[PDB]
Ligand binder design. Structure first.
Ligand SMILES: CC(=O)O[C@H]1C(=O)[C@@]2(C)[C@H]([C@H](OC(=O)c3ccccc3)[C@]3(O)C[C@H](OC(=O)[C@H](O)[C@@H](NC(=O)c4ccccc4)c4ccccc4)C(C)=C1C3(C)C)[C@]1(OC(C)=O)CO[C@@H]1C[C@@H]2O
Ligand SMILES: Nc1nc2c(ncn2[C@@H]2O[C@H](COP(=O)(O)OP(=O)(O)OP(=O)(O)O)[C@@H](O)[C@H]2O)c(=O)[nH]1
Ligand SMILES: Nc1nc2c(ncn2[C@@H]2O[C@H](COP(=O)(O)OP(=O)(O)OP(=O)(O)O)[C@@H](O)[C@H]2O)c(=O)[nH]1
Ligand SMILES: Nc1nc2c(ncn2[C@@H]2O[C@H](COP(=O)(O)OP(=O)(O)O)[C@@H](O)[C@H]2O)c(=O)[nH]1
Ligand SMILES: Nc1nc2c(ncn2[C@@H]2O[C@H](COP(=O)(O)OP(=O)(O)O)[C@@H](O)[C@H]2O)c(=O)[nH]1
Ligand SMILES: [Mg+2]
Ligand SMILES: [Mg+2]
Lengths: 110, 432, 430, 430, 432
C-alpha cells in the first residue's frame, strides 16, 4: 500500500543533490532507487550539517549504496518537511514512519 | 497535602476546563489575577508573592482554541509556560494524533508535567479531560496515558470522556476513533467517566426550561460534576472520599471501569419554588431514567455499584432512610452477587452558582457516579456503527497513509467484541 | 500558521479572484492600498493566513496570478482591489492559449511553468507552516485546464503532503459556451482524480436559476455570479481563521468528507438567499436555514439531488447561534430523508459551527455536499465526448501539438471508470 | 591609521571613481569644495583613511588619477566633485593608448610611470600606517589593462607586504564590446594572479539585467551601473572606518576568504534592490536580505552560481540589526544548500556586522562570494583567445610593439593552469 | 588586601569587559567619574582625591573598539595609560598576533601590568578575557600567558575563553586559531572557563522570550557569571571561596581544567511571577541539557566536579537537602572514582540587575561551574573541523608567510589528539 518512494526522490533530487556539480552523481544513485521495492527508505548522513554519503532502507536496514545498523549507534533524528524543504530535527527517538533521516556517532568514522 | 494535577487534551477537554477553572476561583475567592482578598493547596501552587497558579497543562495540537485562553479573563492566572500550542492538528484523524503530530511534541508535554510533580509532596492523581470524538482528543490521550503510567504506575488516572451519542453526532469517523481510543487506553485508564452530549440537551430542555443551550451552558453542568467529585479534597465534611477511594468502590473488575454521571438538582430559577427538594427528594431525582446523562435505559440493565456524593447541608440519618426506600423499590434492580452496593459521601459545602449562569441557589446537591450494566448496549452499538463502515472498507485510506496498519483494526474490534461479553458476564448468576 | 497559497489560472478564476479578494478585504477591514482600518482585533488575529505584512504596516495578498496573454491581467491591474497584489507575481506569457488544451500544457505551458514554480517557491518560504493550495479555474477553457492540470502535476511533486483544492467551474448541460469543451473536461478529470484531494464542481447553468428564481434578479451579470461563488469560497475557510465553538478546517473537511480517494467531487450550497424586499416574509432561524439548503434548487451543481444518494455532508454554519438547534435540525432532516442518505454511513453530517457571521448578516450556512448526484454529469460529458470522437472531429488542433489517439481513449476509460465507481458505491447495501 | 591609497586607471576606472568619490562624500558629509558640514562625529572619526586634512579645515581625497589622453580627465575636472582632487596628482600623458595593450605597458608605459610612482611615493608618506592600494580598471581596454598591470608589478616591488585589491570590470559573454578584448584579458590575468591578493571580477552583462529585471529601469546609463558598482565598493570598506559589532577590514577579508594563493577572484552582490514603487511590497529584514543575495539574479558576475560550487562566502551587513537573526540566516542557507557549498570547508560563511547603514536606508547586505562558478569565465575567454590565435589575426599591432609568440603561449598556458585548479579543488572530496 | 587584576585581549574580551566594569559599578555605587556618595579594594586602587580607578589593562592590536571606550560612558573612569592600542590587527591570523605584530607591543603590556603588581600587597589572580575565535584573542593571549607565568608562576590565572560553536561560526579559519591557542596555553593555563554563543541563543530565546538578542544582551549574561565567581572577594557570606581555592576543587588533573558555566534563574519580567524559585527549585534548573551554556549534551558524559556558587538569601539547610536529591537521581551520573563531587558556596549578595536589562529582579542565584566529560565530544569535533581543512592543505599560506613552521601544526594536533584520550582516561573505571 503505502511507501516513502515519492518523498525520498523529492528529498534527494531537491535538497542535498540539486546542484549541477553532483548531477552525474545524482543519476548514479537515481537508477539504484528504481530497482528496489522497499516500503520504507531512510537516509544516513555523516555530520549534523547533513552531508549526504549513503542511502539505506528500513523494514517494519540494508545498505543500498556500515551495512546494518541498530538502535544504539543512532544519535539524532531528521524529518524532511516538504514545506520548508529542510531536514528538521525530531525530539522523538523511535525510528518510525515520520523519521526521514538520522546521524550516527563519530566513533564509527575514525 | 494531597495534590492533584489536570491535563486538558483536545478542544472538548479545554473548553470544559475553561469553565472548570472558572469555577474553583468562585469557590475560593480567587481573582483572575491569582490574588485573593490553606486547605486548597491541591489544585494550586502559590508564589512567594501573593499569587496562586493552577496545576494545568492545556495541551493542543492546533493553536486556535488555546489563543482564546491567552486573551480571555483567565490570562492572568495560568503560567505562560503551561499552555502548549503546535503546528497543525490531527484533524479527526487518529493516525495523526498518535503517530505523526502528537509524537512530535510528546516530550514537551511530559517535561512540564515533570516540573509539576516535583512541587507535590503528596501527589494523588490526574484529571485528564478529553472526548472520544476528535483526533486531538483520541490519539493524543492514548499516547499520553501509555507514557504517564510507565512513568508512574502507582497513581490514579481519571478520564472524563465526552461520550459519542447514539443518535446525534457531529462527526463522520467518530466510530472509527472510539474503538481505537478504548483498545489503546484500556489498561492505562483507571476510571473513565462517560458523559454524553445528547442527554444533556434533554436536561437543558425539560428540567431547565431552556430551548437554546449554548455550549457556554452545557459545560457549566459538567463543571458542577467535576467540582463535586473533587469537593472532598478541597473541603472537609463528615464522611469524606478521596480519589484513591473511588477506584476501589466503583470498579469491580480490571476491565469494566466505565461509570456514568448524574447530577441533581438541575432546575431553573423560577422552579426553585413549587417544591422543597429534600434529602430524600433529590435522591429520587438520581435513579430516574430521565436524568441519566448518558442516553441509555437504566431499566435495561442492573447497577453493580452506585456511588452517591452529596454536598451541602445533609444530615446522615436521612440518607439511610432514603437509601432503604430505594433498595426495596422494584424497577430499580441491583446485581445478585453484590449484596449491598452503595457508597455515601457528604461534604460540608453547598454548590455555588456561577454569576450569569442558569441554576438556582440550592442548599444541597448530589453527584451520582453509578457503575451500571446499561452501558453495555451502547457498547453493543458502536461496533454496529463500526462494521457497516468497515465491510465496504470506507475511510481506511486516511488512517493507513499516516502510520497505521490495516491489520490493527480487526484487532481492536476483537478486543472490543471481547469487552461486550464481560458486561454479559456480569448479568448472569453463577447459581451455586 | 496554516497558511494557504492562492493560485489563479484561466480567464475564469482571475475574474473570480478579483471578486474573491474583494470579498476577503471586507471581512478584515482592508483598503485598496493594503493597510488595516477595521474595528475587530480578530481581523488581525489570523490575518497572516492569506497575507504577508510588508514594511510600513501594509498587507499584501499571498496570491499568484497566472495567464497566457495580458488581456485579463490588464483589467485587474486597472480595476480597484487589483493594485494590492505583488507585481512580481503576475506570471503571464504572450502567445495566448487560444482555447486549446494541448497548447497550454505542452506548448505554452512548458515555457511558463518554470517562472510560475519559483514564484510559488518564493511564497511558501515566507510562511510559518503551510496548509494548502487553493486553485480557481474552469474545466472548459484552454488556459484554465492546460495550465490548470500542469501545476498540480508539478506542485504535488514539490509538495506530496499538503491539500489541493480546485474550485473548478464545470461545463453545463443546457448551454455550451465552447464547441470543444467535452474535449477539455475529459482531459481535466484525468489530472484531477489522480492528484487533488477535493474538487468543487460548480456549474454555470444552475447558478442562474438561483439568481433568477430565488434571488429574484433581472440581469445576472458575471459580477453577480462570481459575487455568489466567492461566498462559498470564503465560507469554507472561515472556520480555520476565526474561533468557532466547534472548529473545522481544510483537513477536517477532507477526512470527514471523502470515503474513497477518487470520489472527491463536492457541490456547494449557500443560505440565506433573499430578494431586495422579500426579506420580510421569513424568519432567520436554523430550522429555516436548513430546509432552504436541502432543496433541489439550492445545489449550485446542475444536477437533481433526488436522482441519486448522498454520502457525506458538511454544513459549515456561521453567525452566532446555539448548538442544539443545529443538532436537532441536522437530525431532523436525516430522519425524514433517510432514503436519500445512504445506509452504510451512520451519522453522515459533519457539523461545523463558527462564531463570526458574514459582514452585515446575522447567520449563514455554507453547505458542502458529496453525492451520487453527479454520476450523470460524468454520464453527460462522457457521452458528449464519444460521439464527437467516433467521427473524431476537432482532432487536428490537438494532434498538431504532440498528442495521439492513444491518450484520448485513456481519459475516456478513466472517466468511465469513475462512472462505475459512483454506481458501485450507490447501491451496495449490507 | 590603516590608510588606503586609491589609484584609478583607464577610461572605465576614471569614471567609476568620479562616482565612487561622489559616493563617499555623502557618507562623511563632504561638500564639493572639500569641507565638513555633516551631522555625526562618526563621520570625522575616520575621515583620514581616504583623506588628508589640508589647511583651513579642507579635506582632500587621497586619490591618484592616471590616464594616457586628456579626454577623460577634462570630463572629471569640469564636472562636480572633480575640483576636489589634488591637481598635482593628475598624472597623464598625451599619446593615448588607443585601446592597445602593447602600447600602454611597453611603449607609453615606461614614459609616464616614473611620474606615477613618485606621486605614489608622495602619497604614502602622508599616512600613519598604510593599509593598501585599491584600484579601479577593466580587463578589456588598452589603458586599464596595460597601465594597471604595469603599476602592480612596480608597486609590489615598492610595497611587498600591503594588500592589493583591483576592482576590475570583466568582459561580457554576449556582446564583444572590443574587437580584441580576448587579447587584453589574458595578458592582464598574467599580472593579477601573481601580484594582487584579491580581484573583484565584475561583469557588465549581468549588471544590465539587474537594472532591467529587479530594479525596473527603462534607460540604464553608465551613471546607473557605476552607481551600483560603487555601492559594493564602499560597502567593503565601511567596516574599516566605522565601529561595528563584528569588525572586518581588508586583511580579515583576505585570510578568511582566499584559500590558495592563486584562486582569489571574487564576485560580489548587493541587497536591497528595490524599485521606485515596488518597495512597499516586502519586508526589510535579514531573512529577506539573505535570500535576495543567493539568487542567480543577484550576482553581478555573468555566471550561474548553480553551475559550480562555493568555497568561502563573505557577507558584510550594514545597519543596526541583531546577531541571532544573522547567525540563524547564515546557518539557514547552508543546510538547505549543502550541495552548493564545498565539503572540505566547513562553516564557510564569514560575517561582518557594522553599526552604520548606507545614508538613508535601514540595513544593507554587501555580498562578496568566492566560487568555482567562474571556471567558465576563464573557459570562455581562453577559447576566444584560441580561435583568434590559430589564424593569429589582429596580431600586427602587438608584435610591432615588441612582443613575441612566446608570451602569447605562456599566458594561454597560464590561464589553462587556472582552469585546472578550479577543477582540481572542486571534485576533491574527503 | 586581596587584589586581582584583569586583561582584555582581543575584541571579544573588550566588548565583554565594557559590560563587566559596567556591572561592578552597579554593586558599589561607583560613578563613571570614579566618585561615590571598603572591601571593594580588590578591583580598585583609589586616589587621594575622591576617585577609584579599576585594575584593568585593555589591550588590542586594532585601534577600533578601544576608541569607543575612550568616547563612551566610561571615559572618565579608566586611566589613559592603561588603554594600549596598536597599529594594525592580527586579522584572524594566529601567526600575526604571536610572532609578527603582537611581539612588538608586548613590552608595553607587561610593563603596565608591572606597575600594577606593586599597588597590591595581596596580589591574587589574573583574568584574561578572550576568545578562541579571533586572531588577537587567540594569538596575543598565548603570547601573554607564557610571559606572566615566567614572571610569576605562583598566581592563579583564570581565563574566560569564548568557545567556538559546533554549528554557527562567524569565521572561516576559526578551527586554525583554536587548535593552536589551546596547545600553547595548556602548560600555562590554570583554569580556563568555557562559554559558547550558540547555547546562549537558546537561553536568549526560550527562557527569556527574546528573538533578537544584541551583543549588548549576550554580554549581560556572561557578565553575571563573572560577577558571581568574583563575589566571594568583594563580599562576605557564610561560605566564601577564593580564586586560589577554585584551582584545587574543580581541577582533577594538570590537563583537564575546562569548566563550563551555567547561571540560573534566567527569566523575563513577565515570567518573573507565576513561580517561586526556591533553593531546591533553581538547583534543578542547572542540571538540564537545556540550560548548559555550552552546546554539549551533559547526559553523554559524567560530571567529575561541580561547584555551586550560590548567592542571595540562600539558607544552607536546603542546599544539603537539594544535593541529596540530585546525587540520587538517575540520569545525572558521577564518576566512579569520585565519591561526591560538589563545592558549595553561599554569599550574602542578591544579584543586582543592570537598568535597561532583560533579566528579572531575583532574590537568589547560582553560578554553576561544572566540569564534566561532556565537553570531550566537542574536542572530538574541532579536530574534525581541522583535518578536512588540512588534508587538502587549505589556508596554510597565510601562516607560513608570517613565521610558523609547517611541521608545527601536526605537532599541535597529535598533542591535541593526546588530550582526547585523557578524557577517555577519565571515563573508564579502574575496578579492583
Ligand atoms: C443594509 C443591509 O443590511 O444590506 C444587506 C442586504 O440588504 C441583503 C439583502 C444582501 C445584499 O446582497 C445582494 O443584494 C446580492 C446581490 C447579488 C448577488 C448576491 C447578493 C448586499 O448587497 C450584500 C451584503 O453582504 C455583505 O456585506 C456580506 O459581507 C457579503 N459581501 C458581499 O457579498 C460583497 C458585496 C459587495 C462588495 C464586496 C462584498 C458576503 C457574503 C458571504 C461571504 C463574504 C461576503 C449585505 C449584508 C447587504 C447588501 C449591501 C445590500 C443579501 O446577500 C448577501 C450575500 O448578504 C441578499 O440576501 C442577503 C440578505 C441581506 O440582508
Ligand atoms: N460537551 C461539549 N462537547 C463538546 C464541546 N465542543 C466540542 N464538543 C464535542 O467534541 C466532539 C468532537 O471532538 P473534539 O474533541 O471537539 O475535537 P478535537 O479533540 O479538538 O480534535 P480535532 O479533530 O483535532 O479537532 C463532539 O462530540 C462534540 O460534541 C463543548 O464545548 N462541550
Ligand atoms: N559573546 C560575544 N562574543 C563576541 C562579541 N564580539 C565578538 N565576539 C566573538 O569573538 C569571535 C572573534 O574574535 P575577535 O575578538 O573579534 O577577533 P580578534 O581576536 O580581536 O582579532 P581580529 O581578527 O584582528 O579582529 C567571534 O566568535 C565572535 O562571535 C561580543 O560582544 N560577545
Ligand atoms: N462563473 C463564471 N464563469 C465564467 C466566467 N468567465 C468565464 N466563465 C466560464 O468559463 C468558461 C470558459 O473558460 P475560460 O476560463 O474563459 O477559458 P481559458 O481562459 O482558456 O481558461 C465558460 O464555461 C464560461 O462560462 C466568470 O466570470 N464567472
Ligand atoms: N561599468 C562600466 N564599464 C565601463 C564604463 N566605461 C567603459 N566601460 C567598459 O570598459 C571597457 C572598455 O575599456 P576602457 O577602459 O574604456 O579602455 P581603456 O581606457 O584603454 O582602459 C568596455 O568593456 C566598457 O563596457 C563605465 O563607465 N562603467
Ligand atoms: Mg482539535
Ligand atoms: Mg579584533
Amino acid at each position: 500500500s503505502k511507501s516513502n518512494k515519492p518523498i525520498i526522490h523529492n528529498a534527494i533530487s531537491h535538497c542535498c543533490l540539486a546542484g549541477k556539480v553532483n548531477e552525474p552523481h545524482k543519476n548514479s544513485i537515481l537508477e539504484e532507487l528504481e530497482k528496489c521495492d522497499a516500503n520504507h527508505y531512510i537516509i544516513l548522513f555523516r555530520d549534523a550539517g547533513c552531508q549526504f554519503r549513503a542511502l539505506y532502507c528500513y523494514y517494519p536496514i540494508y545498505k543500498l549504496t556500515p551495512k546494518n545498523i541498530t538502535k544504539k549507534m543512532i544519535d539524532k533524528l531528521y524529518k524532511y518537511s516538504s514545506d520548508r524543504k529542510q531536514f528538521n530535527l525530531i525530539p522523538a527517538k523511535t525510528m518510525s514512519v515520520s523519521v526521514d533521516a538520522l546521524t550516527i556517532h563519530n566513533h564509527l568514522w575514525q | 497535602m494531597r495534590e492533584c494535577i489536570s491535563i486538558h487534551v483536545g478542544q472538548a477537554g479545554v473548553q470544559i476546563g475553561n469553565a472548570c477553572w472558572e469555577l474553583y476561583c468562585l469557590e475560593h475567592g480567587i481573582q483572575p489575577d491569582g490574588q485573593m482578598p490553606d486547605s486548597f493547596n491541591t489544585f494550586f501552587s502559590e508564589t512567594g508573592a501573593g499569587k496562586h497558579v493552577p496545576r494545568a497543562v492545556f495541551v493542543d495540537l492546533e493553536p486556535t482554541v488555546i489563543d482564546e485562553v491567552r486573551t480571555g479573563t483567565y490570562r492572568q492566572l495560568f503560567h505562560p509556560e503551561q499552555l502548549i500550542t503546535g503546528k497543525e492538528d490531527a484533524a479527526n484523524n487518529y493516525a495523526r494524533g498518535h503517530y505523526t503530530i502528537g509524537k512530535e511534541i510528546i516530550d514537551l508535554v511530559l517535561d512540564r508535567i515533570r516540573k509539576l510533580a516535583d512541587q507535590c509532596t503528596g501527589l494523588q492523581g490526574f484529571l485528564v479531560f478529553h472526548s472520544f470524538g476528535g483526533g486531538t482528543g483520541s490519539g493524543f490521550t492514548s499516547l499520553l496515558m501509555e507514557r504517564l503510567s510507565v512513568d508512574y504506575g502507582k497513581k490514579s488516572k481519571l478520564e472524563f470522556s465526552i461520550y459519542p451519542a447514539p443518535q446525534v453526532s457531529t462527526a463522520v469517523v467518530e466510530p472509527y476513533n472510539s474503538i481505537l481510543t478504548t483498545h489503546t487506553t484500556l489498561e492505562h485508564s483507571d476510571c473513565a467517566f462517560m458523559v454524553d452530549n445528547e442527554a444533556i440537551y434533554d436536561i437543558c430542555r425539560r428540567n431547565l426550561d431552556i430551548e437554546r443551550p449554548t455550549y457556554t451552558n452545557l459545560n457549566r453542568l459538567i463543571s458542577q460534576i467535576v467540582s463535586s467529585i473533587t469537593a472532598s479534597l478541597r473541603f472537609d465534611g463528615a464522611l469524606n472520599v478521596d480519589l484513591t477511594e473511588f477506584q476501589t468502590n466503583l470498579v469491580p473488575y480490571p476491565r469494566i471501569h466505565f461509570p456514568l454521571a448524574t447530577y441533581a438538582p438541575v432546575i431553573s430559577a423560577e422552579k426553585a419554588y413549587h417544591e422543597q427538594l429534600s434529602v430524600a427528594e433529590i435522591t429520587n431525582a438520581c435513579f430516574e431514567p430521565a436524568n441519566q446523562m448518558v442516553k441509555c435505559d437504566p431499566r435495561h440493565g442492573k447497577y453493580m455499584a452506585c456511588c452517591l456524593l452529596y454536598r451541602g447541608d445533609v444530615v446522615p440519618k436521612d440518607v439511610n432512610a432514603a437509601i432503604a426506600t430505594i433498595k426495596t423499590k422494584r424497577s430499580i434492580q441491583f446485581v445478585d452477587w453484590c449484596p449491598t452496593g452503595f457508597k455515601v459521601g457528604i461534604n460540608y459545602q453547598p454548590p455555588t452558582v456561577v454569576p450569569g449562569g442558569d441554576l438556582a441557589k440550592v442548599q444541597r446537591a448530589v453527584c451520582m457516579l453509578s457503575n451500571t450494566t446499561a452501558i453495555a448496549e451502547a457498547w453493543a452499538r458502536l461496533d454496529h456503527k463500526f462494521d457497516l463502515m468497515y465491510a465496504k472498507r470506507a475511510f481506511v485510506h486516511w488512517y493507513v497513509g499516516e502510520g497505521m496498519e490495516e491489520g490493527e483494526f480487526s484487532e481492536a474490534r476483537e478486543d472490543m467484541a471481547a469487552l461486550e461479553k464481560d458486561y454479559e458476564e456480569v448479568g448472569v448468576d453463577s447459581v451455586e | 500558521m496554516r497558511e494557504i497559497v492562492h493560485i489563479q489560472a484561466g480567464q475564469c478564476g482571475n475574474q473570480i479572484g478579483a471578486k474573491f479578494w474583494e470579498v476577503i478585504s471586507d471581512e478584515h477591514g482592508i483598503d485598496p492600498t493594503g493597510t488595516y482600518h477595521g474595528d475587530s482585533d480578530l481581523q488581525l488575529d489570523r490575518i497572516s493566513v492569506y497575507y504577508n505584512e510588508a514594511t510600513g504596516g501594509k498587507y499584501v495578498p499571498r496570491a499568484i496570478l497566472v495567464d497566457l496573454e495580458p488581456g485579463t491581467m490588464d483589467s485587474v491591474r486597472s480595476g480597484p482591489f487589483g493594485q494590492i497584489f505583488r507585481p512580481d507575481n503576475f506570471v503571464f506569457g504572450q502567445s495566448g492559449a487560444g482555447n486549446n488544451w494541448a497548447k497550454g500544457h505542452y506548448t505554452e505551458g512548458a515555457e511558463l511553468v518554470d517562472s510560475v514554480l519559483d514564484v510559488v517557491r518564493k511564497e511558501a518560504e515566507s510562511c510559518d507552516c503551510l496548509q494548502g493550495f487553493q486553485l480557481t479555474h474552469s474545466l472548459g477553457g484552454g488556459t484554465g485546464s492546460g495550465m490548470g492540470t500542469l501545476l498540480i502535476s508539478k506542485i504535488r511533486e514539490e509538495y506530496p503532503d499538503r491539500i489541493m483544492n480546485t474550485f473548478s467551474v464545470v461545463p453545463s448541460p443546457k448551454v455550451s459556451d465552447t464547441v470543444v469543451e467535452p474535449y477539455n473536461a475529459t482531459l481535466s478529470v484525468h489530472q484531477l482524480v489522480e492528484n487533488t484531494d477535493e474538487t468543487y464542481c460548480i456549474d454555470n447553468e444552475a447558478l442562474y436559476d438561483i439568481c433568477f428564481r430565488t434571488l429574484k434578479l433581472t440581469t445576472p451579470t458575471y459580477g453577480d455570479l462570481n459575487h455568489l461563488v466567492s461566498a462559498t469560497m470564503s465560507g469554507v475557510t472561515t472556520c480555520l481563521r476565526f474561533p468557532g465553538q466547534l472548529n473545522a478546517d481544510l483537513r477536517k473537511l477532507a477526512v470527514n468528507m471523502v470515503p474513497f480517494p477518487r470520489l472527491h467531487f463536492f457541490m456547494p450550497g449557500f443560505a440565506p438567499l433573499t430578494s431586495r424586499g422579500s426579506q420580510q416574509y421569513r424568519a432567520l432561524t436554523v430550522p429555516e436555514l436548513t430546509q432552504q439548503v436541502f432543496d433541489a434548487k439550492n445545489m449550485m451543481a446542475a444536477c437533481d439531488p433526488r436522482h441519486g444518494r448522498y454520502l457525506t455532508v458538511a454544513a459549515v454554519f456561521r453567525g452566532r447561534m446555539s448548538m442544539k438547534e443545529v443538532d436537532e435540525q441536522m437530525l431532523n432532516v436525516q430522519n425524514k430523508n433517510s432514503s436519500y442518505f445512504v445506509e452504510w454511513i451512520p451519522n453522515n453530517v459533519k457539523t461545523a459551527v463558527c462564531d463570526i457571521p458574514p459582514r452585515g448578516l446575522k447567520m449563514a450556512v455554507t453547505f458542502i455536499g458529496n453525492s451520487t448526484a453527479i454520476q450523470e454529469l460524468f454520464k453527460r460529458i462522457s457521452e458528449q465526448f464519444t460521439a464527437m470522437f467516433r467521427r473524431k472531429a476537432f482532432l487536428h488542433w490537438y494532434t498538431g501539438e504532440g498528442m495521439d489517439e492513444m491518450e484520448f481513449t485513456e481519459a475516456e476509460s478513466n472517466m468511465n471508470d469513475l462512472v462505475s465507481e459512483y454506481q458501485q458505491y450507490q447501491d451496495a447495501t449490507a
